[PDB]
Structure formats: structure tokens, C-alpha cells
Amino acid sequence: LVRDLPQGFSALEPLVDLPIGINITRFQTLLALHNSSSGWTAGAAAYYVG
Amino acid sequence: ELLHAPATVCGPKKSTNLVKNKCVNFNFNGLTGTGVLTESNKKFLPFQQF
């Protein structure tokens, strides 16, 4: 239990190769809950981007 | 053709056997050199090669 990111250390292991030759300029992500009663809507959660 | 993108098409690799406890040359996925290969008592992480 914590209200924020943990006071510790962890190293990140590699997942993919993907030799993709694309010139990337920007970024956009998304996932939310959408019911069928009141039409398209949104959930209530946040994610971190650094 | 080949201009900028990383190779996506190549031919077969004519590999051979492996000789231990002898002075031999070697080539591990392009990593060339010489010496004697012996059983190690140490471990690599699952994704580490050299």
C-alpha cells in the first residue's frame, strides 16, 4: 500500500526487436469504459508519462 | 535492393559443430575471436547473449 510510486529500484528488461524504419513525430494513447446506455463515455483513472 | 532499412532478407547461415576444451577459433552470431571454450558455473539472464 502506497499513495505514490515506491521508494525503490527496478531494472527494465527488453521485450521486442521490431526493425521498423518509421519517422515518428507524436504520440496518442487510449483506453476507457464505454457503456451502451448513455452513449460513448469515459472511466476514471490516470496514467503516468515521462 | 538495400538503401537504409535494416536487412529483412538474407541467405542461410552455414553453421557447424561446437568444440570444447580445445584451442579453436569461433564465430557466435558475428562475434569472432579465438580461445578455449569451457563449461561455465555462472548464469546469464534469459535474454543476454554475450
mmCIF file of N, CA, C and O in Angstrom:
data_model
loop_
_atom_site.group_PDB
_atom_site.id
_atom_site.type_symbol
_atom_site.label_atom_id
_atom_site.label_comp_id
_atom_site.label_asym_id
_atom_site.label_seq_id
_atom_site.Cartn_x
_atom_site.Cartn_y
_atom_site.Cartn_z
ATOM 1 N N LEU A 1 0.825 -1.198 0.000
ATOM 2 C CA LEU A 1 0.000 0.000 0.000
ATOM 3 C C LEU A 1 0.861 1.250 0.000
ATOM 4 O O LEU A 1 1.781 1.384 0.808
ATOM 5 N N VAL A 2 0.548 2.162 -0.911
ATOM 6 C CA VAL A 2 1.274 3.413 -1.053
ATOM 7 C C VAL A 2 0.408 4.400 -1.833
ATOM 8 O O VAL A 2 -0.421 3.993 -2.644
ATOM 9 N N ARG A 3 0.597 5.695 -1.604
ATOM 10 C CA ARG A 3 -0.172 6.707 -2.333
ATOM 11 C C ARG A 3 0.539 7.192 -3.596
ATOM 12 O O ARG A 3 0.028 8.055 -4.311
ATOM 13 N N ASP A 4 1.728 6.665 -3.840
ATOM 14 C CA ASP A 4 2.569 7.098 -4.949
ATOM 15 C C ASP A 4 3.570 6.015 -5.344
ATOM 16 O O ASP A 4 3.615 4.945 -4.744
ATOM 17 N N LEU A 5 4.390 6.312 -6.341
ATOM 18 C CA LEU A 5 5.435 5.401 -6.790
ATOM 19 C C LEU A 5 6.351 5.016 -5.613
ATOM 20 O O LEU A 5 6.652 5.857 -4.762
ATOM 21 N N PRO A 6 6.791 3.750 -5.551
ATOM 22 C CA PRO A 6 7.560 3.147 -4.473
ATOM 23 C C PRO A 6 8.963 3.717 -4.350
ATOM 24 O O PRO A 6 9.591 4.092 -5.337
ATOM 25 N N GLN A 7 9.473 3.738 -3.128
ATOM 26 C CA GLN A 7 10.825 4.217 -2.892
ATOM 27 C C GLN A 7 11.831 3.089 -3.010
ATOM 28 O O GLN A 7 12.326 2.571 -2.010
ATOM 29 N N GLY A 8 12.113 2.703 -4.246
ATOM 30 C CA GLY A 8 13.000 1.580 -4.515
ATOM 31 C C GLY A 8 13.585 1.640 -5.921
ATOM 32 O O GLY A 8 13.484 2.660 -6.610
ATOM 33 N N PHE A 9 14.215 0.540 -6.332
ATOM 34 C CA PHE A 9 14.865 0.442 -7.635
ATOM 35 C C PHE A 9 14.482 -0.839 -8.360
ATOM 36 O O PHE A 9 14.427 -1.911 -7.758
ATOM 37 N N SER A 10 14.250 -0.723 -9.662
ATOM 38 C CA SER A 10 13.973 -1.876 -10.506
ATOM 39 C C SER A 10 14.515 -1.642 -11.910
ATOM 40 O O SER A 10 14.345 -0.564 -12.479
ATOM 41 N N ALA A 11 15.180 -2.647 -12.465
ATOM 42 C CA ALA A 11 15.723 -2.534 -13.812
ATOM 43 C C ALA A 11 14.742 -3.117 -14.826
ATOM 44 O O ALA A 11 14.058 -4.098 -14.536
ATOM 45 N N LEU A 12 14.673 -2.513 -16.009
ATOM 46 C CA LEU A 12 13.725 -2.939 -17.037
ATOM 47 C C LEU A 12 14.355 -3.835 -18.104
ATOM 48 O O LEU A 12 15.336 -3.462 -18.747
ATOM 49 N N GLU A 13 13.755 -5.006 -18.308
ATOM 50 C CA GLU A 13 14.209 -5.981 -19.299
ATOM 51 C C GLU A 13 13.580 -5.703 -20.669
ATOM 52 O O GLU A 13 12.433 -5.262 -20.729
ATOM 53 N N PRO A 14 14.302 -5.966 -21.771
ATOM 54 C CA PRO A 14 13.884 -5.794 -23.159
ATOM 55 C C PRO A 14 12.789 -6.770 -23.562
ATOM 56 O O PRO A 14 12.798 -7.925 -23.141
ATOM 57 N N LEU A 15 11.865 -6.306 -24.403
ATOM 58 C CA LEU A 15 10.769 -7.148 -24.880
ATOM 59 C C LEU A 15 10.782 -7.457 -26.384
ATOM 60 O O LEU A 15 10.432 -8.566 -26.787
ATOM 61 N N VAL A 16 11.107 -6.466 -27.219
ATOM 62 C CA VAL A 16 10.957 -6.628 -28.671
ATOM 63 C C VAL A 16 12.171 -6.176 -29.473
ATOM 64 O O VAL A 16 13.019 -5.437 -28.975
ATOM 65 N N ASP A 17 12.203 -6.582 -30.743
ATOM 66 C CA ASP A 17 13.187 -6.105 -31.704
ATOM 67 C C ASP A 17 12.577 -5.067 -32.656
ATOM 68 O O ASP A 17 13.010 -3.918 -32.700
ATOM 69 N N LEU A 18 11.568 -5.491 -33.410
ATOM 70 C CA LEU A 18 10.834 -4.647 -34.353
ATOM 71 C C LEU A 18 11.677 -3.601 -35.095
ATOM 72 O O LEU A 18 11.624 -2.412 -34.768
ATOM 73 N N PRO A 19 12.411 -4.006 -36.142
ATOM 74 C CA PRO A 19 13.239 -3.174 -37.005
ATOM 75 C C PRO A 19 12.375 -2.310 -37.926
ATOM 76 O O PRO A 19 12.356 -2.508 -39.140
ATOM 77 N N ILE A 20 11.639 -1.373 -37.332
ATOM 78 C CA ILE A 20 10.696 -0.543 -38.073
ATOM 79 C C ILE A 20 11.232 0.853 -38.396
ATOM 80 O O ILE A 20 11.422 1.687 -37.510
ATOM 81 N N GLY A 21 11.432 1.115 -39.685
ATOM 82 C CA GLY A 21 12.003 2.375 -40.160
ATOM 83 C C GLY A 21 10.976 3.497 -40.327
ATOM 84 O O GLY A 21 10.765 3.993 -41.434
ATOM 85 N N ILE A 22 10.344 3.901 -39.230
ATOM 86 C CA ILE A 22 9.352 4.975 -39.285
ATOM 87 C C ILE A 22 9.774 6.233 -38.549
ATOM 88 O O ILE A 22 10.203 6.190 -37.397
ATOM 89 N N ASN A 23 9.605 7.366 -39.220
ATOM 90 C CA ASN A 23 9.883 8.662 -38.624
ATOM 91 C C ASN A 23 8.691 9.105 -37.781
ATOM 92 O O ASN A 23 7.665 9.527 -38.314
ATOM 93 N N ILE A 24 8.826 8.964 -36.468
ATOM 94 C CA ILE A 24 7.758 9.266 -35.523
ATOM 95 C C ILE A 24 7.844 10.709 -35.052
ATOM 96 O O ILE A 24 8.924 11.187 -34.704
ATOM 97 N N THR A 25 6.712 11.407 -35.069
ATOM 98 C CA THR A 25 6.688 12.802 -34.651
ATOM 99 C C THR A 25 5.853 13.056 -33.392
ATOM 100 O O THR A 25 6.055 14.058 -32.704
ATOM 101 N N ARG A 26 4.900 12.168 -33.099
ATOM 102 C CA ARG A 26 3.965 12.382 -31.987
ATOM 103 C C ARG A 26 3.399 11.072 -31.428
ATOM 104 O O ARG A 26 3.735 9.987 -31.901
ATOM 105 N N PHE A 27 2.579 11.180 -30.382
ATOM 106 C CA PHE A 27 2.040 10.020 -29.665
ATOM 107 C C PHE A 27 0.648 10.252 -29.068
ATOM 108 O O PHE A 27 0.391 11.289 -28.453
ATOM 109 N N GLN A 28 -0.231 9.257 -29.186
ATOM 110 C CA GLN A 28 -1.523 9.312 -28.502
ATOM 111 C C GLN A 28 -2.010 7.926 -28.075
ATOM 112 O O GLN A 28 -2.047 6.999 -28.887
ATOM 113 N N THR A 29 -2.418 7.796 -26.808
ATOM 114 C CA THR A 29 -2.924 6.521 -26.286
ATOM 115 C C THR A 29 -4.359 6.634 -25.800
ATOM 116 O O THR A 29 -4.877 7.741 -25.644
ATOM 117 N N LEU A 30 -4.997 5.485 -25.547
ATOM 118 C CA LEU A 30 -6.370 5.491 -25.035
ATOM 119 C C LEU A 30 -6.920 4.136 -24.606
ATOM 120 O O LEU A 30 -6.876 3.167 -25.365
ATOM 121 N N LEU A 31 -7.559 4.120 -23.439
ATOM 122 C CA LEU A 31 -8.492 3.060 -23.064
ATOM 123 C C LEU A 31 -9.408 3.543 -21.953
ATOM 124 O O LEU A 31 -8.960 4.126 -20.966
ATOM 125 N N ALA A 32 -10.703 3.317 -22.137
ATOM 126 C CA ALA A 32 -11.715 3.737 -21.181
ATOM 127 C C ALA A 32 -12.947 2.859 -21.295
ATOM 128 O O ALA A 32 -13.165 2.210 -22.317
ATOM 129 N N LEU A 33 -13.755 2.851 -20.246
ATOM 130 C CA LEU A 33 -15.006 2.113 -20.238
ATOM 131 C C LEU A 33 -16.099 2.899 -20.956
ATOM 132 O O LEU A 33 -16.299 4.079 -20.678
ATOM 133 N N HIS A 34 -16.806 2.240 -21.872
ATOM 134 C CA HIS A 34 -17.897 2.871 -22.612
ATOM 135 C C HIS A 34 -19.170 2.037 -22.569
ATOM 136 O O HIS A 34 -19.239 0.972 -23.179
ATOM 137 N N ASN A 35 -20.187 2.524 -21.871
ATOM 138 C CA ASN A 35 -21.424 1.765 -21.764
ATOM 139 C C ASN A 35 -22.289 1.985 -23.002
ATOM 140 O O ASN A 35 -21.903 2.714 -23.916
ATOM 141 N N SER A 36 -23.445 1.330 -23.039
ATOM 142 C CA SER A 36 -24.354 1.424 -24.176
ATOM 143 C C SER A 36 -25.662 2.106 -23.793
ATOM 144 O O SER A 36 -26.629 2.088 -24.556
ATOM 145 N N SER A 37 -25.702 2.668 -22.589
ATOM 146 C CA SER A 37 -26.926 3.259 -22.061
ATOM 147 C C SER A 37 -27.033 4.751 -22.356
ATOM 148 O O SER A 37 -28.100 5.242 -22.724
ATOM 149 N N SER A 38 -25.927 5.475 -22.191
ATOM 150 C CA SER A 38 -25.922 6.920 -22.398
ATOM 151 C C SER A 38 -25.001 7.320 -23.544
ATOM 152 O O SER A 38 -24.707 8.501 -23.737
ATOM 153 N N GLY A 39 -24.553 6.331 -24.305
ATOM 154 C CA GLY A 39 -23.649 6.568 -25.421
ATOM 155 C C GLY A 39 -22.195 6.503 -24.977
ATOM 156 O O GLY A 39 -21.884 5.988 -23.904
ATOM 157 N N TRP A 40 -21.303 7.007 -25.820
ATOM 158 C CA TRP A 40 -19.875 6.917 -25.552
ATOM 159 C C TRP A 40 -19.545 7.779 -24.335
ATOM 160 O O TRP A 40 -20.145 8.836 -24.135
ATOM 161 N N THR A 41 -18.631 7.299 -23.497
ATOM 162 C CA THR A 41 -18.297 7.970 -22.239
ATOM 163 C C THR A 41 -16.845 7.735 -21.821
ATOM 164 O O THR A 41 -15.973 7.565 -22.669
ATOM 165 N N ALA A 42 -16.565 7.792 -20.523
ATOM 166 C CA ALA A 42 -15.191 7.631 -20.052
ATOM 167 C C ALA A 42 -15.132 7.023 -18.654
ATOM 168 O O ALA A 42 -16.108 7.058 -17.903
ATOM 169 N N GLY A 43 -13.967 6.475 -18.309
ATOM 170 C CA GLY A 43 -13.731 5.904 -16.987
ATOM 171 C C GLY A 43 -13.102 6.936 -16.056
ATOM 172 O O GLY A 43 -13.235 8.140 -16.275
ATOM 173 N N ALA A 44 -12.431 6.466 -15.006
ATOM 174 C CA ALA A 44 -11.852 7.367 -14.012
ATOM 175 C C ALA A 44 -10.509 6.858 -13.504
ATOM 176 O O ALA A 44 -10.411 6.343 -12.391
ATOM 177 N N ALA A 45 -9.476 6.991 -14.329
ATOM 178 C CA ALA A 45 -8.140 6.531 -13.968
ATOM 179 C C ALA A 45 -7.087 7.371 -14.675
ATOM 180 O O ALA A 45 -7.347 7.932 -15.739
ATOM 181 N N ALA A 46 -5.897 7.444 -14.087
ATOM 182 C CA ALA A 46 -4.800 8.205 -14.674
ATOM 183 C C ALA A 46 -3.587 7.326 -14.907
ATOM 184 O O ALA A 46 -3.351 6.364 -14.173
ATOM 185 N N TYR A 47 -2.797 7.698 -15.899
ATOM 186 C CA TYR A 47 -1.539 7.028 -16.194
ATOM 187 C C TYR A 47 -0.406 8.036 -16.226
ATOM 188 O O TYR A 47 -0.640 9.232 -16.384
ATOM 189 N N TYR A 48 0.820 7.562 -16.044
ATOM 190 C CA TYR A 48 1.965 8.459 -15.983
ATOM 191 C C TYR A 48 2.737 8.475 -17.292
ATOM 192 O O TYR A 48 3.044 7.419 -17.846
ATOM 193 N N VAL A 49 3.121 9.666 -17.745
ATOM 194 C CA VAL A 49 4.002 9.784 -18.903
ATOM 195 C C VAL A 49 5.198 10.679 -18.593
ATOM 196 O O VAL A 49 5.040 11.811 -18.128
ATOM 197 N N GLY A 50 6.400 10.163 -18.836
ATOM 198 C CA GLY A 50 7.623 10.915 -18.573
ATOM 199 C C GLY A 50 8.442 11.087 -19.840
ATOM 200 O O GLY A 50 8.369 10.265 -20.755
ATOM 201 N N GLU B 1 17.155 -4.855 -53.391
ATOM 202 C CA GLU B 1 17.641 -3.508 -53.097
ATOM 203 C C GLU B 1 18.009 -3.358 -51.620
ATOM 204 O O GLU B 1 17.489 -4.081 -50.770
ATOM 205 N N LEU B 2 18.895 -2.408 -51.321
ATOM 206 C CA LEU B 2 19.250 -2.066 -49.943
ATOM 207 C C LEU B 2 19.744 -0.622 -49.853
ATOM 208 O O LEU B 2 20.801 -0.294 -50.392
ATOM 209 N N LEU B 3 18.984 0.241 -49.175
ATOM 210 C CA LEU B 3 19.348 1.657 -49.113
ATOM 211 C C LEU B 3 19.545 2.189 -47.694
ATOM 212 O O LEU B 3 20.512 2.902 -47.427
ATOM 213 N N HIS B 4 18.615 1.883 -46.794
ATOM 214 C CA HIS B 4 18.667 2.457 -45.451
ATOM 215 C C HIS B 4 18.093 1.519 -44.400
ATOM 216 O O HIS B 4 18.634 1.398 -43.299
ATOM 217 N N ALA B 5 16.988 0.864 -44.735
ATOM 218 C CA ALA B 5 16.324 -0.027 -43.800
ATOM 219 C C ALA B 5 17.257 -1.184 -43.465
ATOM 220 O O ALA B 5 18.065 -1.578 -44.306
ATOM 221 N N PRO B 6 17.172 -1.737 -42.249
ATOM 222 C CA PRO B 6 17.924 -2.884 -41.788
ATOM 223 C C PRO B 6 17.517 -4.099 -42.593
ATOM 224 O O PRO B 6 16.367 -4.206 -43.010
ATOM 225 N N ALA B 7 18.457 -5.008 -42.816
ATOM 226 C CA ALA B 7 18.186 -6.176 -43.644
ATOM 227 C C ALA B 7 16.960 -6.924 -43.154
ATOM 228 O O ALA B 7 16.791 -7.146 -41.954
ATOM 229 N N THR B 8 16.112 -7.318 -44.101
ATOM 230 C CA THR B 8 14.920 -8.085 -43.787
ATOM 231 C C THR B 8 15.008 -9.438 -44.481
ATOM 232 O O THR B 8 14.348 -10.402 -44.081
ATOM 233 N N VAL B 9 15.843 -9.500 -45.522
ATOM 234 C CA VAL B 9 16.060 -10.722 -46.287
ATOM 235 C C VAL B 9 17.539 -11.079 -46.345
ATOM 236 O O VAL B 9 18.378 -10.254 -46.718
ATOM 237 N N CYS B 10 17.852 -12.324 -46.010
ATOM 238 C CA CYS B 10 19.229 -12.810 -46.078
ATOM 239 C C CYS B 10 19.242 -14.288 -46.418
ATOM 240 O O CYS B 10 18.197 -14.932 -46.408
ATOM 241 N N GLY B 11 20.417 -14.832 -46.719
ATOM 242 C CA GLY B 11 20.524 -16.255 -47.018
ATOM 243 C C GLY B 11 20.714 -17.064 -45.732
ATOM 244 O O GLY B 11 20.719 -16.490 -44.640
ATOM 245 N N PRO B 12 20.839 -18.395 -45.844
ATOM 246 C CA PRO B 12 21.093 -19.359 -44.781
ATOM 247 C C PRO B 12 22.475 -19.164 -44.176
ATOM 248 O O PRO B 12 23.395 -18.712 -44.857
ATOM 249 N N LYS B 13 22.635 -19.534 -42.910
ATOM 250 C CA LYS B 13 23.943 -19.475 -42.271
ATOM 251 C C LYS B 13 24.571 -20.859 -42.190
ATOM 252 O O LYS B 13 24.011 -21.774 -41.587
ATOM 253 N N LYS B 14 25.746 -21.010 -42.793
ATOM 254 C CA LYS B 14 26.409 -22.309 -42.854
ATOM 255 C C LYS B 14 27.145 -22.630 -41.561
ATOM 256 O O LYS B 14 28.376 -22.607 -41.509
ATOM 257 N N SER B 15 26.375 -22.923 -40.520
ATOM 258 C CA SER B 15 26.916 -23.216 -39.201
ATOM 259 C C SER B 15 27.495 -24.624 -39.127
ATOM 260 O O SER B 15 27.237 -25.466 -39.989
ATOM 261 N N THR B 16 28.272 -24.875 -38.078
ATOM 262 C CA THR B 16 28.877 -26.182 -37.838
ATOM 263 C C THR B 16 28.793 -26.580 -36.367
ATOM 264 O O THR B 16 27.997 -26.022 -35.608
ATOM 265 N N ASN B 17 29.599 -27.563 -35.977
ATOM 266 C CA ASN B 17 29.565 -28.104 -34.624
ATOM 267 C C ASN B 17 30.263 -27.187 -33.630
ATOM 268 O O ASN B 17 30.729 -26.106 -33.987
ATOM 269 N N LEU B 18 30.309 -27.612 -32.374
ATOM 270 C CA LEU B 18 30.941 -26.825 -31.328
ATOM 271 C C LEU B 18 31.986 -27.664 -30.614
ATOM 272 O O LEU B 18 31.708 -28.787 -30.193
ATOM 273 N N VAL B 19 33.193 -27.133 -30.497
ATOM 274 C CA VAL B 19 34.285 -27.875 -29.887
ATOM 275 C C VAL B 19 34.750 -27.245 -28.587
ATOM 276 O O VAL B 19 35.148 -26.082 -28.557
ATOM 277 N N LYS B 20 34.695 -28.024 -27.512
ATOM 278 C CA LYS B 20 35.056 -27.538 -26.186
ATOM 279 C C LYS B 20 36.424 -28.052 -25.751
ATOM 280 O O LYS B 20 36.880 -29.099 -26.209
ATOM 281 N N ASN B 21 37.052 -27.319 -24.834
ATOM 282 C CA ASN B 21 38.328 -27.696 -24.227
ATOM 283 C C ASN B 21 39.449 -27.884 -25.246
ATOM 284 O O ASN B 21 40.329 -28.726 -25.067
ATOM 285 N N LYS B 22 39.430 -27.080 -26.300
ATOM 286 C CA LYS B 22 40.467 -27.103 -27.320
ATOM 287 C C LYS B 22 40.713 -25.686 -27.801
ATOM 288 O O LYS B 22 39.807 -24.855 -27.767
ATOM 289 N N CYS B 23 41.921 -25.399 -28.270
ATOM 290 C CA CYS B 23 42.157 -24.082 -28.836
ATOM 291 C C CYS B 23 41.591 -24.031 -30.238
ATOM 292 O O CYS B 23 42.078 -24.708 -31.147
ATOM 293 N N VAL B 24 40.530 -23.261 -30.393
ATOM 294 C CA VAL B 24 39.812 -23.156 -31.651
ATOM 295 C C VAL B 24 39.509 -21.702 -31.943
ATOM 296 O O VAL B 24 39.616 -20.855 -31.055
ATOM 297 N N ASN B 25 39.093 -21.402 -33.163
ATOM 298 C CA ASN B 25 38.566 -20.070 -33.398
ATOM 299 C C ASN B 25 37.074 -20.127 -33.124
ATOM 300 O O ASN B 25 36.535 -21.203 -32.860
ATOM 301 N N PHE B 26 36.394 -19.000 -33.214
ATOM 302 C CA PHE B 26 34.950 -19.028 -33.081
ATOM 303 C C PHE B 26 34.266 -17.862 -33.763
ATOM 304 O O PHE B 26 34.886 -16.844 -34.078
ATOM 305 N N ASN B 27 32.967 -18.029 -33.975
ATOM 306 C CA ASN B 27 32.095 -17.006 -34.529
ATOM 307 C C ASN B 27 30.685 -17.189 -33.998
ATOM 308 O O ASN B 27 29.943 -18.048 -34.473
ATOM 309 N N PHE B 28 30.316 -16.394 -33.003
ATOM 310 C CA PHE B 28 28.980 -16.504 -32.433
ATOM 311 C C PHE B 28 28.115 -15.358 -32.920
ATOM 312 O O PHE B 28 28.236 -14.232 -32.443
ATOM 313 N N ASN B 29 27.281 -15.627 -33.914
ATOM 314 C CA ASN B 29 26.429 -14.594 -34.495
ATOM 315 C C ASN B 29 27.212 -13.337 -34.882
ATOM 316 O O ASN B 29 26.751 -12.219 -34.648
ATOM 317 N N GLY B 30 28.391 -13.515 -35.475
ATOM 318 C CA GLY B 30 29.220 -12.390 -35.895
ATOM 319 C C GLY B 30 30.326 -12.073 -34.890
ATOM 320 O O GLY B 30 31.284 -11.364 -35.207
ATOM 321 N N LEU B 31 30.221 -12.618 -33.685
ATOM 322 C CA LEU B 31 31.238 -12.375 -32.677
ATOM 323 C C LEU B 31 32.423 -13.290 -32.870
ATOM 324 O O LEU B 31 32.451 -14.405 -32.343
ATOM 325 N N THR B 32 33.390 -12.826 -33.646
ATOM 326 C CA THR B 32 34.550 -13.638 -33.959
ATOM 327 C C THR B 32 35.647 -13.491 -32.919
ATOM 328 O O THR B 32 35.749 -12.465 -32.243
ATOM 329 N N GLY B 33 36.514 -14.493 -32.855
ATOM 330 C CA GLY B 33 37.671 -14.463 -31.969
ATOM 331 C C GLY B 33 38.284 -15.848 -31.830
ATOM 332 O O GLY B 33 37.905 -16.778 -32.545
ATOM 333 N N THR B 34 39.249 -15.978 -30.924
ATOM 334 C CA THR B 34 39.907 -17.257 -30.686
ATOM 335 C C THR B 34 40.026 -17.545 -29.197
ATOM 336 O O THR B 34 39.996 -16.628 -28.375
ATOM 337 N N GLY B 35 40.201 -18.819 -28.856
ATOM 338 C CA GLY B 35 40.421 -19.205 -27.466
ATOM 339 C C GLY B 35 39.853 -20.582 -27.149
ATOM 340 O O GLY B 35 39.527 -21.364 -28.044
ATOM 341 N N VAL B 36 39.765 -20.880 -25.861
ATOM 342 C CA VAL B 36 39.282 -22.164 -25.387
ATOM 343 C C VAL B 36 37.944 -21.994 -24.685
ATOM 344 O O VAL B 36 37.811 -21.174 -23.774
ATOM 345 N N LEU B 37 36.955 -22.762 -25.119
ATOM 346 C CA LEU B 37 35.618 -22.692 -24.548
ATOM 347 C C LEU B 37 35.449 -23.750 -23.468
ATOM 348 O O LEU B 37 35.711 -24.930 -23.708
ATOM 349 N N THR B 38 35.031 -23.329 -22.276
ATOM 350 C CA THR B 38 34.836 -24.275 -21.181
ATOM 351 C C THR B 38 33.491 -24.073 -20.501
ATOM 352 O O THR B 38 32.926 -22.980 -20.519
ATOM 353 N N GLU B 39 32.997 -25.121 -19.853
ATOM 354 C CA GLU B 39 31.739 -25.033 -19.119
ATOM 355 C C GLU B 39 31.809 -23.945 -18.059
ATOM 356 O O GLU B 39 32.756 -23.901 -17.273
ATOM 357 N N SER B 40 30.803 -23.074 -18.029
ATOM 358 C CA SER B 40 30.762 -22.011 -17.036
ATOM 359 C C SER B 40 29.918 -22.413 -15.839
ATOM 360 O O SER B 40 28.911 -23.105 -15.985
ATOM 361 N N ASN B 41 30.298 -21.938 -14.659
ATOM 362 C CA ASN B 41 29.497 -22.159 -13.465
ATOM 363 C C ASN B 41 28.699 -20.910 -13.109
ATOM 364 O O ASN B 41 28.190 -20.782 -11.994
ATOM 365 N N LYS B 42 28.589 -19.993 -14.065
ATOM 366 C CA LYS B 42 27.852 -18.750 -13.876
ATOM 367 C C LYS B 42 26.663 -18.683 -14.824
ATOM 368 O O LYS B 42 26.594 -19.425 -15.804
ATOM 369 N N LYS B 43 25.701 -17.820 -14.515
ATOM 370 C CA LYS B 43 24.491 -17.735 -15.323
ATOM 371 C C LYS B 43 24.321 -16.390 -16.012
ATOM 372 O O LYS B 43 24.803 -15.362 -15.538
ATOM 373 N N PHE B 44 23.603 -16.415 -17.129
ATOM 374 C CA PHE B 44 23.194 -15.224 -17.866
ATOM 375 C C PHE B 44 21.714 -14.987 -17.634
ATOM 376 O O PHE B 44 20.971 -15.940 -17.403
ATOM 377 N N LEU B 45 21.260 -13.745 -17.748
ATOM 378 C CA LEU B 45 19.820 -13.535 -17.731
ATOM 379 C C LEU B 45 19.273 -14.128 -19.035
ATOM 380 O O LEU B 45 20.015 -14.218 -20.013
ATOM 381 N N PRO B 46 17.998 -14.541 -19.084
ATOM 382 C CA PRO B 46 17.346 -15.242 -20.188
ATOM 383 C C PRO B 46 17.471 -14.564 -21.554
ATOM 384 O O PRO B 46 17.337 -15.221 -22.586
ATOM 385 N N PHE B 47 17.691 -13.258 -21.569
ATOM 386 C CA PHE B 47 17.766 -12.513 -22.820
ATOM 387 C C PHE B 47 19.170 -12.013 -23.150
ATOM 388 O O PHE B 47 19.352 -11.283 -24.125
ATOM 389 N N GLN B 48 20.152 -12.364 -22.328
ATOM 390 C CA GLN B 48 21.508 -11.869 -22.541
ATOM 391 C C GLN B 48 22.337 -12.878 -23.324
ATOM 392 O O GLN B 48 22.286 -14.078 -23.057
ATOM 393 N N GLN B 49 23.079 -12.391 -24.312
ATOM 394 C CA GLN B 49 23.806 -13.289 -25.205
ATOM 395 C C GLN B 49 25.319 -13.319 -24.985
ATOM 396 O O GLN B 49 25.940 -14.379 -25.091
ATOM 397 N N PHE B 50 25.919 -12.166 -24.704
ATOM 398 C CA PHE B 50 27.370 -12.097 -24.528
ATOM 399 C C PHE B 50 27.726 -11.483 -23.182
ATOM 400 O O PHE B 50 27.006 -10.615 -22.695
#
